[PDB]
């Protein structure tokens, strides 16, 4: 059992994003 209240992902005023993630994450990610 999981209870969550209030979630805010990556915030304002950005030049460039490479790879911004929220989750459980099972397996993998490659960033170049």
Q: Do 18 and 25 meet the contact criterion of CB atoms below 8 Å apart? A: no
d(CA 20, CA 9): 9
Q: Is 11 annotated as a binding residue?
A: no
d(CA 11, CA 9): 6
x/- mask, a copy of itself, residues 3-32, rule CB under 8 A, reads xxxxxxxxxxxxxxxxxxxxxxxxxxxxxx
CB of 23 to a copy of itself, least distance (A): 3
Q: Is 3 annotated as a binding residue?
A: yes
Residues lying near a copy of itself in the complex (CB under 8 A) are found at 1-32
Binding site members for Cu(2+):
3-4
């Amino acid at each position: 059992e999981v209870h969550h209240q209030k979630l805010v992902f990556f915030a304002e005023d950005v030049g460039s994003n490479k790879g911004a993630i929220i989750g459980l994450m099972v397996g993998g990610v490659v960033i170049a």
